Write a protein that binds this ligand. Structure first.
Ligand code: HEM
Ligand code: HEM
Lengths: 83, 83
């Protein structure tokens, strides 16, 4: 989605590992549906990002790339998601 | 290893998911070696526990079972490990 670094670059270098396959029940990429009821649950594109940073269960905290700015985490959420 | 609940119970209900297979490069169960150079690196059985709680990379924080006392986390470390 957006742009810090990518999400193209970010999904592929960090996010890939679970979201690609669906490993651990990771909401898979392009799966507009799954991601939707999610935003729903946490009030938009900020409930996923505020969510990734914190982490949830088996989803490791901060998406990962403990390097990432907040803008990148959202761009890789933007593009795992659809929106 | 030790006893809060188990680690038998704990490894099997929470820890299983990655350490069983080796999913995500999770140091597998019984693998005395792998776990050893680990304790080494973080000064004993407290560098894994202080470690799990915090989490590291793809290892989700607090082993998981965000329920667990510290004594259980160590007993499931005791028994993933060998020691
Ligand atoms: C890459 C930095 C990355 C981001 C960003 C990210 C985000 C993310 C969101 C927003 C969710 C939904 C959380 C919610 O419902 O609020 C989510 C869910 C899971 N993720 Fe993730 N995720 C990124 C990458 C990774 C990686 C590399 C892993 C595997 C170690 C992983 C795993 C998961 C899992 C599992 C879930 C579902 C967890 C659950 O909802 O029970 N993600 N992720
Ligand atoms: C169950 C509550 C559980 C515990 C406890 C636990 C501990 C643990 C330790 C001590 C390490 C070594 C960390 C270090 O080197 O200091 C470790 C490593 C990894 N784990 Fe784990 N772990 C438990 C369970 C789980 C589960 C359910 C997952 C999968 C979502 C998982 C994953 C991993 C991974 C991956 C690693 C290696 C991470 C890395 O060292 O790069 N663990 N765990």
């Amino acid at each position: 989605g957006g742009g810090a670094r990518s999400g193209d670059d970010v999904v592929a270098k960090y996010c890939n590992a679970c979201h690609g396959t669906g490993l651990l029940n990771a909401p898979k990429v392009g799966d507009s549906a799954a991601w939707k009821t999610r935003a729903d649950a946490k009030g938009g594109l900020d409930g996923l990002l505020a969510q990734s940073l914190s982490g949830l269960n088996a989803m490791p905290p901060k998406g990962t790339c403990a390097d990432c700015s907040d803008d990148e985490l959202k761009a890789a959420i933007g593009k795992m998601s659809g929106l």
